[PDB]
Ligand binder design. Structure first.
Ligand SMILES: *[C@@H]1O[C@H](CO)[C@@H](O[C@@H]2O[C@H](CO)[C@@H](O)[C@H](O)[C@H]2NC(C)=O)[C@H](O)[C@H]1NC(C)=O
Ligand SMILES: *[C@@H]1O[C@H](CO)[C@@H](O[C@@H]2O[C@H](CO)[C@@H](O)[C@H](O)[C@H]2NC(C)=O)[C@H](O)[C@H]1NC(C)=O
Ligand SMILES: *[C@@H]1O[C@H](CO)[C@@H](O[C@@H]2O[C@H](CO)[C@@H](O)[C@H](O)[C@H]2NC(C)=O)[C@H](O)[C@H]1NC(C)=O
Ligand SMILES: *[C@@H]1O[C@H](CO)[C@@H](O[C@@H]2O[C@H](CO)[C@@H](O)[C@H](O)[C@H]2NC(C)=O)[C@H](O)[C@H]1NC(C)=O
Ligand SMILES: *[C@@H]1O[C@H](CO)[C@@H](O[C@@H]2O[C@H](CO)[C@@H](O)[C@H](O)[C@H]2NC(C)=O)[C@H](O)[C@H]1NC(C)=O
Ligand SMILES: *[C@@H]1O[C@H](CO)[C@@H](O[C@@H]2O[C@H](CO)[C@@H](O)[C@H](O)[C@H]2NC(C)=O)[C@H](O)[C@H]1NC(C)=O
Ligand code: NAG
Ligand code: NAG
Ligand code: NAG
Ligand code: NAG
Ligand code: NAG
Ligand code: NAG
Lengths: 418, 86, 203, 50
């Protein structure tokens, strides 16, 4: 069939009508980014010649080709630790949450480390971790999974108990629901909205985050993005090794059979033939590994900026820290990558209201100081635009500029003087 | 160690900020001999969290950070014919 | 090792060039790396085999150089793109992006020229000398709930004040620096205080 | 069938007619001892960067 691009929809546009959300929901988005890849390296000489001495000496006729290849892979291996460090090591100190986890009803036990387990990982990290020789070698990372988990724990503890101040300066304590109140003001929703709905917000949060653990258990293709990195590197390695069985025109792919079967003055032709073939396949591997490394680096750079702006702050960037109005993020460690749980505010249950750009009052034009002017059908009120919460229109929530003969669509009302 | 066999460095039970990385959580440094240790990730710290307590800065400092970025590289070019055949 | 980052670029390109040149001394299986010795020493119908052998070797090494130079160029371009956005947002403005224009609360930046690169001096505001204060989400006053208009409500142990959250500067709590929403039976952790009315001293 | 490496006792079980085994990359992983028929694993001789 011809594919659909999206559902059919229309906005009920009118020159004097606005919709304003009256109830909000909170949801958690899971965003997976690769940070690093397996530090695979292979030495050119052993890969090509094995234990054949005449091959090893003949190979010197290719000059520095082996040096260039060994150097390129070494450079990648170093880069992989740089990519990891610049993403997770965003802290100066390792912070921990208190023994008494009173965060105002907000339950973070799913993202905080589980002390009952020897690996001390969170209940969600457990799912992220559980689901994902002839001259070649794989080097270990500088930072082991345990150390990555410790950096992640420090970031969560920082985010939960000190908000973003641990990023910009010293970690200054703040009541959890109070930093959430700050985060609401940060998206254009006045803080009183949170305090009158703190129980509701905590319950929506707790459910939205708990659903992450459930969703990831039923969706094999949730962490495919990190698995794809592992698979591409695994294939590249396996291809490089099986390629040694290729003879490239030689009588045999095995150096030990040609050196013992064929007289030296001719065996050298077949040895050289195999070297050209194997050197070319190694050059191909390294070239693709460099290109692939660049892709991983670009992702690591994104993860690094995303952590700084989504976790150690509150970005204002649309759809950067997930869809919706960003409140905060909680990172989780994953094999060869990082997973961000983005907590966002989403408008809901909007209603149709009649509007005006200004209120006319004894000849003066009054504009809303911060919100919008709306009508419920009989009375005019001023509301914040991100949450319906009607106030009587007064001289303290409006300002005067110009007069009633200038503004288009101005309406007549009474502005209360306290 | 996990990374490999390290000979000539001594193993100590004290963690330190890393210097020369080895791998698998192990770093080495020079004291009066070369030592190897599990690297520290950062200083030990805790935030004095309480449901009714906030900390507010009372004096600020201003500092300057230097950030270096490459923009360009030497415009090296070589013609294939002269390079190969002279 | 302050400017090592720009030096590393110079070093990688210098090595690539020097490697490409020294590689010409490699013979790739030919009797000699030098074309002038094989063309004068070895009869033409066979010299062509060794000349072709050297061409394949040298063409391959040149292809390798160019390929790595293209990959390296991409890395430099990505850095240049970062420098370009960073200058626009850190120098020609004031970003709100954390740790983008250095650590701390960004105020302004001053670029400096460097060989093959740019150096940014980022001027940032950093909180210091913090003190512990007791807080409340709201003040209860004759049944109404008062929330801070811009700062936070803090207590020094005997009196409640309202302060900006990024710098301690206590103000008496008044009706001009708070707003009313709902009442004292809804907010969790609300405390009882007196909210000053600037009009009361006259009326 | 030639090779080089370190021979150790294997915990693998070959079918009665099998003489040697291979891994995913089609490299000899183990052999059967032709005189006593025990299975021997072949591990690589260690090597690595120094
Ligand atoms: C935070 O949520 C967890 C669930 O994710 C709660 O742990 C459960 O507690 C009940 C008892 O009320 C047990 O029956 C469950 O088996 C526990 N589940 C798990 C996974 O441990 C935890 O009590 C909640 N904490 C707070 C403060 O609300
Ligand atoms: C705003 O929406 C929330 C749901 O997100 C409403 O809360 C639910 O109310 C129903 C009863 O109708 C209960 O069964 C649910 O358990 C409640 N959910 C939560 C998380 O509390 C809330 O009442 C709505 N408020 C307004 C003013 O419409
Ligand atoms: C617009 O809002 C006003 C204020 O809430 C509504 O008027 C009130 O209606 C209630 C009955 O539900 C009365 O008890 C109040 O005394 C009325 N207040 C005033 C000032 O008249 C009004 O009905 C709403 N209009 C619409 C179309 O819903
Ligand atoms: C708002 O009030 C003003 C009066 O303060 C109204 O002005 C009238 O405008 C008409 C033209 O449409 C004139 O013929 C009248 O003479 C004006 N009245 C006065 C007292 O000057 C204005 O029309 C009102 N606007 C709305 C939307 O009701
Ligand atoms: C909280 O701040 C108030 C106001 O500055 C302090 O009260 C003042 O203390 C000085 C002495 O240092 C007196 O001269 C003033 O007359 C007092 N003012 C008032 C309104 O009482 C109070 O001591 C501070 N509390 C704490 C615990 O430091
Ligand atoms: C703030 O002031 C109100 C009175 O305006 C206090 O209300 C009392 O609450 C208790 C229950 O704890 C009732 O038994 C009393 O009868 C209420 N008093 C009145 C006059 O109704 C409220 O407790 C005070 N809050 C704090 C923290 O001091
Ligand atoms: C507003 O009214 C239009 C009819 O003109 C209707 O289609 C739309 O769904 C209404 N929107 C809301 C939020 O009630
Ligand atoms: C909206 O359009 C109608 C004409 O259909 C006009 O009478 C009315 O004044 C306009 N209102 C505004 C705010 O432009
Ligand atoms: C480290 O501590 C253990 C006891 O847990 C002790 O046996 C060991 O000798 C110590 N090692 C060093 C280098 O001090
Ligand atoms: C706040 O009090 C705690 C004790 O509970 C103390 O450890 C902490 O250092 C104090 N913070 C400041 C800024 O004085
Ligand atoms: C803080 O917790 C204590 C219980 O230890 C409780 O009595 C107090 O009312 C709480 N304050 C706030 C603001 O939640
Ligand atoms: C090897 O010789 C022994 C006698 O010591 C015999 O039992 C065994 O079956 C022989 N192995 C094979 C493969 O024939």
């Amino acid at each position: 069939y011809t594919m659909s691009l999206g559902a059919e929809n229309s906005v009920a546009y009118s020159n004097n009508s606005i919709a304003i959300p009256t109830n909000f929901t909170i949801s958690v988005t899971t965003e997976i980014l690769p940070v690093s890849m397996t530090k695979t390296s292979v030495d050119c000489t052993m890969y090509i010649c094995g234990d054949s001495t005449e091959c090893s000496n003949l190979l010197l006729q290719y000059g520095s080709f082996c040096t260039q290849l060994n150097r390129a892979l070494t450079g990648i291996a170093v880069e992989q630790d740089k990519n990891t460090q610049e993403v997770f090591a965003q802290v100066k100190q390792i912070y921990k949450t208190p023994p008494i986890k009173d965060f105002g009803g907000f339950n973070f036990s799913q993202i905080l480390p589980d002390p009952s387990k020897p690996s001390k990982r969170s209940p969600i990290e457990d799912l992220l971790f559980n689901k994902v020789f002839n001259g070649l070698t794989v080097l270990p990372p500088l930072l082991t999974d345990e150390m990555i988990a410790q950096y992640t724990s420090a970031l969560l503890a920082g985010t939960i108990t000190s908000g973003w101040t641990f990023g910009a300066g010293p970690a200054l304590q703040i009541p959890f629901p109070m930093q959430m109140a700050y985060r609401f003001n940060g998206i254009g929703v006045t803080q009183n909205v949170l305090y009158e709905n703190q129980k509701l917000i905590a319950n929506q949060f707790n459910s939205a985050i708990g659903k992450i653990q459930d969703s990831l258990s039923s969706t094999p293709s949730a962490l495919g993005k990190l698995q794809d990195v592992v698979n591409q590197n695994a294939q590249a390695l396996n291809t490089l090794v099986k390629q040694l069985s290729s003879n490239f025109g030689a009588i045999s792919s095995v150096l030990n059979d040609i050196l013992s079967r064929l007289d030296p003055p001719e065996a050298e032709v077949q040895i050289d033939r195999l070297i050209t073939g194997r050197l070319q396949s190694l050059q191909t591997y390294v070239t693709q590994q460099l290109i692939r490394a660049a892709e991983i680096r670009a992702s690591a750079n994104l993860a690094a900026t995303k952590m700084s702006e989504c976790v150690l702050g509150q970005s204002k960037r649309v759809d950067f820290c997930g869809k919706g109005y960003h409140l905060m993020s909680f990172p989780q460690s994953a094999p060869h990558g990082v997973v961000f749980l983005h907590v966002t505010y989403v408008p809901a249950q909007e209603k149709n209201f009649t509007t005006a750009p200004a209120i006319c009052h004894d000849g003066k034009a009054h504009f809303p100081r911060e919100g919008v002017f709306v009508s419920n059908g009989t009375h005019w009120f001023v509301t914040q635009r991100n949450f319906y919460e009607p106030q009587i229109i007064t001289t303290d929530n409006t300002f005067v500029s110009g007069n009633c003969d200038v503004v288009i669509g101005i309406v007549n009302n009474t502005v209360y003087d306290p | 160690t996990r990374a490999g066999c390290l000979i000539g460095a001594e193993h100590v039970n004290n963690s330190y900020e890393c210097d020369i990385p080895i791998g698998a959580g192990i770093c080495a440094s020079y004291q009066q001999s070369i030592i190897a240790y599990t690297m520290s990730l950062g200083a030990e710290n805790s935030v004095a969290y309480s449901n009714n307590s906030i900390a507010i800065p009372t004096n600020f400092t201003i500092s300057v950070t230097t950030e270096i970025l490459p923009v360009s590289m030497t415009k090296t070019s070589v013609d294939c014919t002269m390079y190969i055949c002279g | 090792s302050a400017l090592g980052k720009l030096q590393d670029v110079v070093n990688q390109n210098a090595q690539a060039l020097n490697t490409l040149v020294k590689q010409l001394s490699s013979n790739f299986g030919a009797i000699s790396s030098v074309l002038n010795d094989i063309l004068s020493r070895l009869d033409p119908p066979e010299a062509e085999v060794q000349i072709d052998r050297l061409i394949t070797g040298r063409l391959q090494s040149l292809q390798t150089y160019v390929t790595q130079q293209l990959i390296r160029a991409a890395e430099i371009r990505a850095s240049a793109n970062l420098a370009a956005t960073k200058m626009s947002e850190c120098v020609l403005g004031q970003s709100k992006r954390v740790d983008f224009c250095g650590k701390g609360y960004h105020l302004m930046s001053f670029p400096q020229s460097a060989p093959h690169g740019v150096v940014f001096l980022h001027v940032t505001y950093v909180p210091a000398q913090e003190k512990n204060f007791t807080t409340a989400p709201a003040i209860c006053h004759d049944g109404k709930a008062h929330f801070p208009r811009e700062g936070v409500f803090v207590s020094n142990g005997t009196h409640w004040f309202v302060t900006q959250r990024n710098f301690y500067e206590p103000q008496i709590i008044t009706t001009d620096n708070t707003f009313v929403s709902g009442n004292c039976d809804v907010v969790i952790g609300i405390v009882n205080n007196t909210v000053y009315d600037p009009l009361q001293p006259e009326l | 069938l030639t090779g080089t490496g370190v021979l150790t006792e294997s915990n693998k079980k070959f079918l009665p007619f099998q003489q040697f085994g291979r891994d995913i990359a089609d490299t000899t992983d183990a052999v059967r001892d032709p005189q006593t028929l025990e299975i021997l694993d072949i591990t690589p001789c260690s090597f690595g960067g120094v």
